[PDB]
Amino acid sequence: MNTLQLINKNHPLKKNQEPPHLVLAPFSDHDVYLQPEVAKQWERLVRATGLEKDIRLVSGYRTEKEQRRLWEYSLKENGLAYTKQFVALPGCSEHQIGLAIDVGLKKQEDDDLICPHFRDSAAADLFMQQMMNYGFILRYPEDKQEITGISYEPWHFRYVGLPHSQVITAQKWTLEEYHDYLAQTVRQFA
Template identity: 50%
Template sequence: MTVLAKKRIPFPRLINAAHCLTPFEVPADLVEAPFSAGKAQVSLEVAEQLSQLIHHVGGEKQIIVTSGYRSYAEQQCLYEHSLTKYGRAHTENYVAKPGCSEHQLGHAVDLGFADTTNDEVCPTFEGREVSQKFLASMANFGFVLRYPKGKEVVTGIAYEPWHFRYVGRPHSEIMCQQSWTLEEYQAFLRDGGEVYGNHDLR
């Protein structure tokens, strides 16, 4: 089994249909995700920052983590189950193929409201004051909305108001300031873009 390195990498890793993980890659520092009732795991730093963020927005009794880390095998089961239950069109819009899911990194979470029944693929996390506060504050704690509305062509995934990715600061702040997806941010860096003091971009 290959274990992903614990040390911080310079820039957040891009995982999508073109940049996949092997079946054997597993985060080295998985812990219980906060507000998941023991049903989900995430990497340690993600857990710490997410807990602080949820407390910051007063969501302790309103927000739950419906999904965190998923192994390659778990993602394969979810993908096949979604194909059977929802069909190919829905599945290709909302469920990544095995190896192509950020959940395997341990740096992604799906969030839902504690007082609703949340779908396993598409939980409910939109239209309430606490979810708006979460969106407004997430960048300060290293999180971004990974699949925003209007960026479907870029990400290859439909709008998912429940799916958040931990990229760390200052990456989260830059991405939110520029309204960039991780694909767009990586392209900026790949093309020679640099980040200067106070997030000035050149």
């Protein structure tokens, strides 16, 4: 239930953690599933930006087995080096808690894993202006690979909710940096 939960290579998904409730998300060519609050905020964000005809939900919730099959597919498709840069290991993906979304342009053949498209597009620029106001952050920003362990991905967004998304974005932080900031702040009251 913790919308701030940190999931990466060093902090894998809890095996004792209960699977989140999921609903079918709107504005998607495929059947994408997300947590209710995330799906609702995603819909509000699209309608508020007027991007119903320009952006689409490419990916959402993925099970550990689906994340594994994705990783294996990328391995044969793009190699080990590229896969490790853009695809998280099974159990270390925030897609597995239904808080992560992959966004792509409405017109497109290839997803940004193949031939990057979303970056610096008209739809992206307007999306980047309001996304933090609806609980979303850019999960893997540019020049942050050292901290996140993942290369720059302008199409991957993470729901953390308000006002966390506004705070993180304004400081140009990552979720890792946000947790370190929170950890340090708590120790001041100790």
